[PDB]
Amino acid sequence: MMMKISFIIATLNSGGAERVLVTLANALCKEHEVSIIKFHTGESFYKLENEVKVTSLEQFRFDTLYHKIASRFKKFFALRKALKESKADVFISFLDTTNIACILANIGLKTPLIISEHSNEAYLKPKTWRFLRRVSYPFCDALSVLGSSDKVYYERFVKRVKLLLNPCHFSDEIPFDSSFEKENLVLFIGRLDHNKNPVMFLKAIAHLDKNLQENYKFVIAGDGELRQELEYKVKSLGIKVDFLGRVENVKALYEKAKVLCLCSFVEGLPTVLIESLYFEVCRISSSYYNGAKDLIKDNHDGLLVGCDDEIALAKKLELVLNDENFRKELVNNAKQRCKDFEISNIKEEWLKLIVEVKNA
Numbered sequence: 431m432m433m434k435i436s437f438i439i440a441t442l443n444s445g446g447a448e449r450v451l452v453t454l455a456n457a458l459c460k461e462h463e464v465s466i467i468k469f470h471t472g473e474s475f476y477k478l479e480n481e482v483k484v485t486s487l488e489q490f491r492f493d494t495l496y497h498k499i500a501s502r503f504k505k506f507f508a509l510r511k512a513l514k515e516s517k518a519d520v521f522i523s524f525l526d527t528t529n530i531a532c533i534l535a536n537i538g539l540k541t542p543l544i545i546s547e548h549s550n551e552a553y554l555k556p557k558t559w560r561f562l563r564r565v566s567y568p569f570c571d572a573l574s575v576l577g578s579s580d581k582v583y584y585e586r587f588v589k590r591v592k593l594l595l596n597p598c599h600f601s602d603e604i605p606f607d608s609s610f611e612k613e614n615l616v617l618f619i620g621r622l623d624h625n626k627n628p629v630m631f632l633k634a635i636a637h638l639d640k641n642l643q644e645n646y647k648f649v650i651a652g653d654g655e656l657r658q659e660l661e662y663k664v665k666s667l668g669i670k671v672d673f674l675g676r677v678e679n680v681k682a683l684y685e686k687a688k689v690l691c692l693c694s695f696v697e698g699l700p701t702v703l704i705e706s707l708y709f710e711v712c713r714i715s716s717s718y719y720n721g722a723k724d725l726i727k728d729n730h731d732g733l734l735v736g737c738d739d740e741i742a743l744a745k746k747l748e749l750v751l752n753d754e755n756f757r758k759e760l761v762n763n764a765k766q767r768c769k770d771f772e773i774s775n776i777k778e779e780w781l782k783l784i785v786e787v788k789n790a
């Protein structure tokens with residue numbers, strides 16, 4: 431058959447949850463009718479297939495006390511409005527606060543709703559939001575999670591929880607056979623906020639051999655609050671790092687890069703550590719809270735570093751950039767994990783979840 435599937439998400443900016451949603455929608459939009467309701471006006475950062483319909487909610491003032499109060503009430507009823515007109519067989523909502531809003535807005539409407547979490551359980555820190563997540567999530571029809579630790583946490587107060595890995599859209603484009611002409615390039619792709627911890631990337635570059643810094647180009651793809659602070663630590667440390675802002679063609683960067691470094695403290699299942707697999711990019715990652723070992727088998731598929739260890743990241747960096755035959759062997763083993771993130775297999779596991787919850 432064919433189903434109307436409505437995705438609900440706050441924004442569609444250069445983030446991981448957004449990348450997965452566009453990947454899923456683009457895959458489902460051929461055989462089903464998929465719409466996307468987003469709170470933020472503006473165009474999707476990721477290329478979206480013409481068949482998926484995107485509707486952005488009204489824009490509301492937030493400058494004054496009356497509007498800060500009124501806009502939220504107006505936002506809720508515009509979302510309840512959009513849900514009714516979508517005429518969907520199923521709703522799929524993304525990320526913590528938007529899941530709760532959909533739980534409430536969907537009250538009354540006769541369509542099942544699937545919520546999905548994307549960071550670890552622990553990334554949501556405020557005491558109050560952890561509570562509203564606890565009382566409201568039992569009222570969903572199913573919950574998609576990324577790791578086994580989050581499955582165990584939510585299963586005790588959510589009845590249907592399914593673990594669905596992130597699908598990588600590069601598994602369609604990039605053929606599993608391609609040779610790469612690597613350059614002396616090292617990537618840090620991610621948001622420039624505290625948890626991504628990009629300062630660890632900078633301090634680790636400063637501790638690299640003078641030969642490596644002189645003959646390698648280090649770039650930071652992404653943006654965030656810490657952008658200007660990092661620009662000044664690059665001068666404080668006296669290194670050469672190329673800030674690129676948000677980048678559409680990460681395929682080009684992944685195509686030339688030899689190493690990608692992830693330095694986060696807490697993560698669910700980082701897509702930069704998945705996308706890298708298709709481009710023979712060597713992953714060096716901090717042992718972020720939880721995931722870690724299921725993406726990187728240390729010294730076999732990649733290199734792991736303790737959390738916030740600027741020197742350990744530097745020694746691992748020199749290991750790979752001073753031993754191309756070892757980085758190649760590290761990276762050829764990583765190719766085995768490509769099958770785990772193929773779009774076609776993961777789309778069919780969402781379709782099982784959708785028809786399973788559609789038995790209401």
Ligand SMILES: O=c1ccn([C@@H]2O[C@H](COP(=O)(O)OP(=O)(O)O)[C@@H](O)[C@H]2O)c(=O)[nH]1
Nearest residue numbers: 444445446447449651652676677700701702
């Ligand atoms: O300048 C950028 C920065 C990031 N991304 C994409 O945004 C995603 C990052 O998601 P991640 O797995 O790191 O999880 P998140 O940091 O969003 O929680 C990746 O697919 C990147 O390819 C991008 O396309 N351009």
Ligand SMILES: [Cl-]
Nearest residue numbers: 446447548549
């Ligand atoms: Cl994510």
Ligand code: NA
Nearest residue numbers: 491492493498
């Ligand atoms: Na705000």
Ligand code: NA
Nearest residue numbers: 446698699700
């Ligand atoms: Na993530």
